[PDB]
């Protein structure tokens, strides 16, 4: 019976954080900043998908020709094994062919 | 786990409150209850 007896602590989330109040500022910087940047530039994350949607396979391939040169050893080998499996799935398996 | 379902207790008791008066094991266990409460309705 995984329900819990004493009710959990209340999560006081401050909506007027410095990050939620400044959420989305300096977006729309291309239209009314006369197009020096794109809003696709300002995001901060991985280097391979810096502004690129992809698929489950396409994010795994783009990681391999862009970053896969300087990847850890077993973290490369378990990245080639997925494309050797997702090519055997997305192109061979499923419905609707 | 993202989204592991919490409220199973209130899903079991939607059937067992029509199964508090059964004979045997079926008034306790949920697997043996819904084989009767479905037939009971």
């Amino acid at each position: 019976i995984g329900i819990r007896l004493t009710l959990p602590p209340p999560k006081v989330v401050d909506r007027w954080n410095e990050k939620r109040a400044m959420f989305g500022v300096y977006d729309n910087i291309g239209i009314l900043g006369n197009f020096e940047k794109h809003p696709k530039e300002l995001i901060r994350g991985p280097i391979w998908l810096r502004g690129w949607k992809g698929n489950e396979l396409q994010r795994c391939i783009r990681k391999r020709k862009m970053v896969g040169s300087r990847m850890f050893a077993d973290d490369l080998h378990n990245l080639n094994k997925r494309i050797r499996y997702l090519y055997k799935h997305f192109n061979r398996h499923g419905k609707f062919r | 786990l993202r989204n592991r379902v919490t409220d199973r207790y209130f899903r079991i008791q939607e059937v067992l409150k029509h199964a508090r008066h059964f004979r045997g094991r079926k008034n306790r266990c949920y697997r043996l209850a819904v084989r009767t409460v479905i037939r009971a309705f």
């Binding site: 329900i3 819990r4 007896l5 009710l7 959990p8 | 592991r4 919490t6 409220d7 207790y9 209130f10």
Partner: peptide
Amino acid sequence: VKKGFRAAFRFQKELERQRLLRCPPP
């Protein structure tokens, strides 16, 4: 532990309704 609050609170609003049948109010 799970990330829920709305289920244990319905449990907390049920466990008073077992108290008021076991040990009744005057």
